[PDB]
RNA sequence: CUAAGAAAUUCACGGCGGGCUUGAUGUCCGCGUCUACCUGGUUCACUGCCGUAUAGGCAG
C-alpha cells in the first residue's frame, strides 16, 4: 500500500485460455487475486535482480471473449469443455468442468526500489516484458505479436517527481494507451452503504449482492431499478476456517516448510470504470494485504474513494 | 461524464484495427472526421492540402457533439425559465471543458 | 365566445422574386434587354480580428493566429464594369378579401370576425393603409442595401390588366422621404388602385421596376442563402447568394417585409421610423421587440379584446390590426 | 453601460475590382479603349499574366464610393449603448472633422499602394483621379505616385483639396464617387501581378483583375499610431493590428492600446485616448465588421 | 510464486409440396439569414540543363 514512485505499463497482453470460474459463485472475468499473485511472481524473478519493489497492479481488460454457449430453449449459458486422455483401461475419462476465456488485459505496476536510480527507464521496461512473455497470468498462456508490430513497446512514468502540471499532462498519455479497456476497482464501501440502507428488514451481506447482480423490475408504488455504474461481484479474498498448522503436519502439501490454513473464498463488490473517470491512476492498483493472526487473506484497491 | 468518455471509448475502437480509413466512401456531412478519428498511419497523405500533416483545435466536431448534447435531451419547456437549464448549460460547459483538453493531444 | 384553435389567414399583397439587371443610365427608358447580374465567386483571405475569448490574452496565441489565416471562398455580385444603374424588377399582385380566413374551427368565431372586419371596412376603407403601402412602393424600401449611397433612384410602376400597361407611374424615391408619408396627387392615383384591390372591387397586378445609379462596377447585394456543411472553408461555406436561372435575385419575403413597413404606431417611438407590421412587433436587426405582450398594444391582445370582448381599440391601432390580417399568418392557438 | 452582443458596422469607402489593360506610354490621350490582360498558361501547368509585348504601360482602373455616416451601426441590440456611441462620435466629429483621416486617405489614392507588387520595380507611375457627380467628370486630378513618398506622408494643396472631398463624403455632406485610373511603366511584356486565386488568377471578363478587398487593404494603411515603432512605415488599420508577412502583431490586449480596449474606454468607461489615438478608433468604424460580444 | 500445476468431442445426413393481401383518402398557412476580410506562406525544393556529380549567360 506504499505510494509508487514509477508506473510500469504492460501495453496489450493477449491471453490465451485463461480461467473464468474465479469463485464458487461468480463466473466471468478471472479473479483479481490472480493478478496480484502474478506481480509477486515478477517480483520473485525480476524485481530482486533489478532491486525494485513490484506491488500494485491495475486491471484494464481491453477484450474479454469467454468460451460459452447457451443451449436450445434455455437462457443460462453453459461452458465449453475439452477432451482428456483415456483411463488406464482406456474406457473414457471423467468430466471436470473448467471455464475458459480468451482475454486482453493491460497491467499498470508500482515500483519502489533504488533500481530506478541505477538502471535507465528502458532497462526497467525491457527486463520485465521479456520475462513476462514466457509466463502465465490466469492459468493461460501469453501470446506475442504479428503482422503490424504497433503495440509492442512498453511505457514508464516516473510519477514521484515533478509539479502537478507535469504529472497531469503526462498522466493523460497513459489514458490514451488504456482507452479501449475498462478499469476495475473494488467498492467495499457501497456494500457497507446499502446494508445500512436495507434495515427495514434484517438482511445479510450475501443477500445484498443478489440485489446488485440485478434486474430488479420494480412494480409501481413498470420500472427498472437504476444502476450508478457497472457494479459486479468479485472475489475479495480468503477467510480461514482452520487453525494454523505446522509446516510438516498436513499431508500432501506443496512444500513442507510453510504453514497451512484451510480457507474459504470471500465475496465483495467491484465496479468497472472508464480510465478517464479516475483522477489519479495510482488509486487504481490492487494490493493484496492480510493479517495472519486471524484468518483474513484479502485484496482490494485502497485509497480509491 | 459517462458520455464524455463513452465517445472516447467509441473513438479508440474506431481508431484501433482500422488503418485503411479515408474520406472517399460516402462523405456528405462528415467534416473534420478525417481530422479527429483519423488513422495516424505513421505518415501523412495529402496532395492539394496541408491540414492532413498535423492538427490543431479539432473542437468543431466537439461543438457538434455539444450541439448534439443539447439535442440529446428530448423536450423540456419548463426548464428554460428555471435556472435548471442554466445549471444544465453549466453541465454542458463543465464537461466540454474536460472534453476539449482530452481531445487536444490526439492532434496537438 | 372563444377563439378558434386554428386560424389560418392567406396572405394578401403577394410579391414575387425580384431579378436584378444592370445597364447604363439614360438607357433606362429602353431597359427591356439589359444583361442580368451574374453571381460570381472569389477567394478571400483575411486575418483573425474578432471579439477576444475570455482569459485568452496570450500574445503568442495572437501571433500563432497570424500564421493560420482565413482562406475563405465567398460569392459576390458586381455590376458590369461599364454599367452604373441597377434595374430591379418584380410583380406585386393584390388579392383582396382580408377578412375571410382559410382554416377556422369555430363557425361562430368566424362569423363574428367577418362582421368585425366589415364594420371596419364600411366605416373607413383600405385607403389609409393603401396610402402607406404606396409609399413603400414609392420610396425604394425593397432596395435594402443597394439604396444606401446612390445618386439617383427612380421607381416605375405599371398596372397591367391584360398583357398591356393600363397606367404607368413615375416616382423619385429619393425626393420622397423614407420616414414620412406625405400625400400627393400622384401617389393617391396609385393608392386608390391598391385600396380597390384590397377591398376586392377589382383586379390589381403591378409591375414594379426600380432603377438606381450606383457606379461603374460597384457591388449589388442580393439576398443570402443558407449553407449546409460540405467540408472545409473552400466550397462556399462562407457566403452563398440567391440566384434563379443564373440571375442574382432577392427573396420575395424580403420584399414582402419591405412593403409592410408601415407601422409608425408604437408604444414608445414618436417619429423614429416605421416598423414592419408584426405580431409582437419586432426588428431582427435591432434585436428589441416593441409592442410587448404585457403592453396592451399587442396584436393578440387587441384582436381578442375586440372580437370576443367586443370593445373597439383605438382607430390609431385599428389600422394595425387589419394590417396583420393582410400579411396573413398562423393565428389562433 | 455595456457593449451589445451584436455590433455590425456597414463599411464605408467601398472599392470595386480593378480591371487591368496594357497600352503604350504617352498614349494617355486615346487611352480609353485598350485590350486587357488575359490569363494564359506555360509548361507544371501554371497561370501567368503578362502584357502584350508591344506595350509597356499597365492601366489599372477601379471606382470608389465614399458613403459616410460612420457612427451608426447597422445592427445593435441595446439602444442606450447605441445612442451613446452616436454621442461619442458626435463628440469626435464636432471637435475635429474627418480631414486628418481623409488626408491620410488622400495619400493612398495618389501614391498607388493598390499597385501592390506592380509599383515596386516600376519607373514611372501616374494616377488619374476623377470626381463624377454625373456621367460627366465634375473634378479631375493628376498625381505622380513615385514623387509622393510611399513610406512618408506629406501634404499638398492638390491633395488637401482632394482630402476635403473625401472628408465631405465621410461626414455625409454629399455624394462622392471616384474614378481611379493608374498608368504605370513596367516594361515590354513584363509580368504584372494580379490577385491570386485559391491556382488560377482572378479574371472577370476573361480579363485579369485584383480583388476589391485587396484594394481596400491598400487604401487603409493609415495607422502609424503603433505601440512599438513607426520606423517600418504605415500599416493597415485593423483591430489587433497585425501583418501576415512580418508575422508578428502589434497592439496586444496586454497593452492598453487595443481597439476593443480603446473603445471600451472611449465610449463605456468615458476615458478618452490621445487625439492621435482617436484617429485609429474611427478608422476601424469605416472598416466595419462584427463587433461586440 | 497466480481456484497453482495436465488435457484431441469425433464420424454421417434431401427440408419440401401449395398460395389473390385487398378497398378508400385535401398537408395545410407564415416568415429579412445578415457583418467584415492581402491568398506575393514556392500549384511540382521547381519549368529547360552540359556529366546524378550544390558543376550555372543556370530562363534563375
PDB file of N, CA and C in Angstrom, chain D residues 88-98 171 282:
ATOM      1  N   UNK D  88     -20.752  59.650 -28.802  1.00  0.00           N
ATOM      2  CA  UNK D  88     -19.298  59.681 -28.715  1.00  0.00           C
ATOM      3  C   UNK D  88     -18.679  60.097 -30.044  1.00  0.00           C
ATOM      4  N   UNK D  89     -19.259  59.639 -31.153  1.00  0.00           N
ATOM      5  CA  UNK D  89     -18.792  60.061 -32.467  1.00  0.00           C
ATOM      6  C   UNK D  89     -19.145  61.525 -32.706  1.00  0.00           C
ATOM      7  N   UNK D  90     -20.316  61.957 -32.224  1.00  0.00           N
ATOM      8  CA  UNK D  90     -20.691  63.364 -32.322  1.00  0.00           C
ATOM      9  C   UNK D  90     -19.787  64.248 -31.474  1.00  0.00           C
ATOM     10  N   UNK D  91     -19.214  63.700 -30.405  1.00  0.00           N
ATOM     11  CA  UNK D  91     -18.144  64.401 -29.708  1.00  0.00           C
ATOM     12  C   UNK D  91     -16.911  64.511 -30.595  1.00  0.00           C
ATOM     13  N   UNK D  92     -16.590  63.438 -31.325  1.00  0.00           N
ATOM     14  CA  UNK D  92     -15.393  63.424 -32.161  1.00  0.00           C
ATOM     15  C   UNK D  92     -15.529  64.362 -33.351  1.00  0.00           C
ATOM     16  N   UNK D  93     -16.641  64.258 -34.086  1.00  0.00           N
ATOM     17  CA  UNK D  93     -16.804  64.983 -35.344  1.00  0.00           C
ATOM     18  C   UNK D  93     -16.898  66.485 -35.099  1.00  0.00           C
ATOM     19  N   UNK D  94     -17.530  66.885 -33.995  1.00  0.00           N
ATOM     20  CA  UNK D  94     -17.648  68.307 -33.689  1.00  0.00           C
ATOM     21  C   UNK D  94     -16.311  68.897 -33.255  1.00  0.00           C
ATOM     22  N   UNK D  95     -15.495  68.116 -32.542  1.00  0.00           N
ATOM     23  CA  UNK D  95     -14.179  68.602 -32.136  1.00  0.00           C
ATOM     24  C   UNK D  95     -13.241  68.721 -33.329  1.00  0.00           C
ATOM     25  N   UNK D  96     -13.230  67.717 -34.201  1.00  0.00           N
ATOM     26  CA  UNK D  96     -12.450  67.777 -35.425  1.00  0.00           C
ATOM     27  C   UNK D  96     -13.148  66.943 -36.487  1.00  0.00           C
ATOM     28  N   UNK D  97     -13.050  67.387 -37.734  1.00  0.00           N
ATOM     29  CA  UNK D  97     -13.716  66.678 -38.807  1.00  0.00           C
ATOM     30  C   UNK D  97     -13.025  65.393 -39.213  1.00  0.00           C
ATOM     31  N   UNK D  98     -13.347  64.897 -40.403  1.00  0.00           N
ATOM     32  CA  UNK D  98     -12.671  63.736 -40.953  1.00  0.00           C
ATOM     33  C   UNK D  98     -11.459  64.115 -41.788  1.00  0.00           C
ATOM     34  N   UNK D 171     -18.271  62.712 -43.843  1.00  0.00           N
ATOM     35  CA  UNK D 171     -19.140  63.475 -42.961  1.00  0.00           C
ATOM     36  C   UNK D 171     -20.585  63.512 -43.437  1.00  0.00           C
ATOM     37  N   UNK D 282     -11.740  55.676 -35.096  1.00  0.00           N
ATOM     38  CA  UNK D 282     -12.734  55.937 -36.131  1.00  0.00           C
ATOM     39  C   UNK D 282     -12.427  55.135 -37.390  1.00  0.00           C
TER      40      UNK D 282
END
